[PDB]
Amino acid sequence: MADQLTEEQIAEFKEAFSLFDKDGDGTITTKELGTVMRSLGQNPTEAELQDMINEVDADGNGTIDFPEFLTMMARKMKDTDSEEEIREAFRVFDKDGNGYISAAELRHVMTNLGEKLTDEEVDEMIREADIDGDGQVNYEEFVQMMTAATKIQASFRGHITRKKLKGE
């Protein structure tokens, strides 16, 4: 979020702000966060709702105001951007469609795009990816490596924006 202000992007937050805060004032309390959560497909109790307030309100009344909203909104946008991406690579890697990448489905794709990586590197990237001792790369643990390995997850990230931008 580079802060360069126009009247359609901020007027995205005013139309959305009052979607959470149905009342009038301008603060999104436990119940202005909730009534929506249930309207947006998911179910939370008055208690785990509160912790979403607590994320951002580093000033603290118990209710989320605009710039402490904007702060949250661009955070969870970044989360679904991260998550989608790590699902995408996974899919363009795991071809079979089972969610368990045998080295085969990681190894060549890289090379097919000419990613330099030796197989000493890839084999190691599957050892630093092999806990209970099987040999292959599934979802959440492909995901988990994303957050040496430093550079490699910028190779993945980039090539995702390809097949996710050119998919959609």
- Quote the DSSP letter at residue 28: B
* Residue 50 shares a structural domain with residue 118: no
* Residue 50 shares a structural domain with residue 100: no
* Residue 88 shares a structural domain with residue 159: yes
Q: What is the resolution of this structure in A?
A: 2.7
Total domain count for the chain?
2
* Residue 24 shares a structural domain with residue 58: yes
Q: Is 95 within 8 Å of 105 (Cβ atoms)?
A: yes
Q: Which domain holds residue 95?
A: 80-168
* Residue 55 shares a structural domain with residue 121: no
Q: Do the annotations mark residue 81 as ligand-binding?
A: no
Q: Is 78 within 8 Å of 110 (Cβ atoms)?
A: no
Q: Do the annotations mark residue 6 as ligand-binding?
A: no
Q: Do the annotations mark residue 120 as ligand-binding?
A: no
Q: Do the annotations mark residue 124 as ligand-binding?
A: no
- Alpha-carbon distance of 8 to 99, in angstroms, equals 40
The residue to which tokens 């090379």 are assigned: 111
Strands (E), the chain: 101-102, 136-137
* Residue 107 shares a structural domain with residue 120: yes
Q: Do the annotations mark residue 134 as ligand-binding?
A: yes
- Alpha-carbon distance of 26 to 16, in angstroms, equals 11
Q: Do the annotations mark residue 83 as ligand-binding?
A: no
Amino acid at site 131: I
Reduced 3-state DSSP string for 34-80: HHHHHHCCCCCCCCCCHHHHHHHCCCCCCCECHHHHHHHHHHHHHHH
Structure determined via? X-ray
* Residue 64 shares a structural domain with residue 147: no
* Residue 65 shares a structural domain with residue 143: no
Q: Do the annotations mark residue 42 as ligand-binding?
A: no
